[PDB]
Curated annotation (Swiss-Prot), chains A, B, C, D, E, F:
This is Microtubule-associated protein tau. The chain holds residues 623 to 695 of 758 of the full protein. The record marks 6, 12, 16, 26, 35, 38, 65, 70 as: Not glycated. The modification Phosphoserine is found at residues 19, 47, 51. Promotes microtubule assembly and stability, and might be involved in the establishment and maintenance of neuronal polarity. The C-terminus binds axonal microtubules while the N-terminus binds neural plasma membrane components, suggesting that tau functions as a linker protein between both. Axonal polarity is predetermined by TAU/MAPT localization (in the neuronal cell) in the domain of the cell body defined by the centrosome. The short isoforms allow plasticity of the cytoskeleton whereas the longer isoforms may preferentially play a role in its stabilization. It is linked to In Alzheimer disease, the neuronal cytoskeleton in the brain is progressively disrupted and replaced by tangles of paired helical filaments (PHF) and straight filaments, mainly composed of hyperphosphorylated forms of TAU (PHF-TAU or AD P-TAU). O-GlcNAcylation is greatly reduced in Alzheimer disease brain cerebral cortex leading to an increase in TAU/MAPT phosphorylations. Frontotemporal dementia 1: A form of dementia characterized by pathologic finding of frontotemporal lobar degeneration, presenile dementia with behavioral changes, deterioration of cognitive capacities and loss of memory. In some cases, parkinsonian symptoms are prominent. Neuropathological changes include frontotemporal atrophy often associated with atrophy of the basal ganglia, substantia nigra, amygdala. In most cases, protein tau deposits are found in glial cells and/or neurons.
């Protein structure tokens, strides 16, 4: 057994923008009500309960590069 | 047994923006109401309960590079 | 037994922004209410309960590079 | 010439209620945008422009008695 | 010329309620914008512009009696 | 010329309420924005511009009696 792991990457995940703006985000309020008796959360739970969240997200470039490199024996 | 791990990366996640602005985030309030008896959370739980959260996030470049490199026997 | 781990990175996660500004964040209040009897949290819990949080986040470059390098037997 | 004006009133505008309640008014927000250039008003105008009004009105008795008594020559 | 004006009133506008309550008024916020250039007003105008008004009005008896009595020559 | 003006009133605008309470008024914020160049007002104007007003009004008896008695020549 010989193993060689040698991937090569020269990629561009690039963006170009001339001018970014005039972005208006005017939410109008709202209402949320949640009822329960018991919550029981185990092992890697992610939760929102009862949320009224407003987000403006304006990256001048929002580029994502995501990788997994893996071996197993 | 022999193993070699030499992955190579020369990548660009780069951005260019000429001018960024005139961004207006103006939430209108809101109402949130949550009821329960018992909350019981175990092992790596992430939780929001009853939130009214406002975010303006304007990164002049918001580029993300995420990598996992991993051997395992 | 022989193992060589020698990954190589010459990458750029850079940004350029020509001018950043004219950002307005004007929240409008709100109301939040939460009820319970018992909270019981064990092992690596992250929690918000009852929040009314406003965030302005304007990094002139907000680039993030995240790496995990690992071996295990 | 003799004029006699003599209304007689012995009326009941009465109400009876045994128990009044469990009234829930839960408005869900909203949005309004009014545009105009020139507004000009004269003589006994009542006006409302661009409104998001919420009213709960729970009189334990909500009776009205309204009269005009008038002579003219 | 002889004129007599003798209205007679023995009227009841009376109310009775046994118990008044459990009233919940819970507005969800909201958003209003009004744009204009020139406003000009003369002689007995009543005006409201750009409002987000919340009213709970719970009179234990809310009775009205309104009268105009008039002579004119 | 003979005039007699002599109205008689023995009226009751009275109320009874046995118990008054458990009233909750919980506004959720809001947002208001008014724009203009020139405001100009003459003679008996009542005006409200750009309001976010919250009113709880709980009179244990809230009765009104309004009378106008008038002569003119």
């Amino acid at each position: 057994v010989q193993i060689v792991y040698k991937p090569v990457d020269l990629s561009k995940v690039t963006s170009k923008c001339g001018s970014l703006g005039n972005i208006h985000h005017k939410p109008g309020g709202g209402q949320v009500e949640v009822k329960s008796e018991k919550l029981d959360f185990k092992d890697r739970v992610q939760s929102k309960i009862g949320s009224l969240d407003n987000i403006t997200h304006v990256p001048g470039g929002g580029n994502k590069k995501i990788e997994t490199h893996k071996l197993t024996f």
